[PDB]
Amino acid sequence: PRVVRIVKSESGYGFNVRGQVSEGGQLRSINGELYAPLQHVSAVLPGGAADRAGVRKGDRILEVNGVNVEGATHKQVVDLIRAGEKELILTVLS
């Protein structure tokens, strides 16, 4: 787990999020710890805000803006990402 601050730029945050549309699901082991399903970063725009902040493709999103998103729907995670006008704090598992 690492915490990253991303500042929205003229290309947005510059990443794509991908994952389940439903809520809940089975536990999975990631790095020896158990988590319910996580959305993940499916693309990172080169030179965009997420890239500059150190976000990488494949990162699993554990928290958005301090809110745990295990088992969250895609919509819940997108809405949390969009909660701030400019600042985004992600906790990711690489």
Binding site: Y13, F15, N16, V17, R18, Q20, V21, S22, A43, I81
Partner: peptide, 7 residues
Amino acid sequence: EDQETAV
């Protein structure tokens, strides 16, 4: 059933 969104 997954979805992908650019942000």
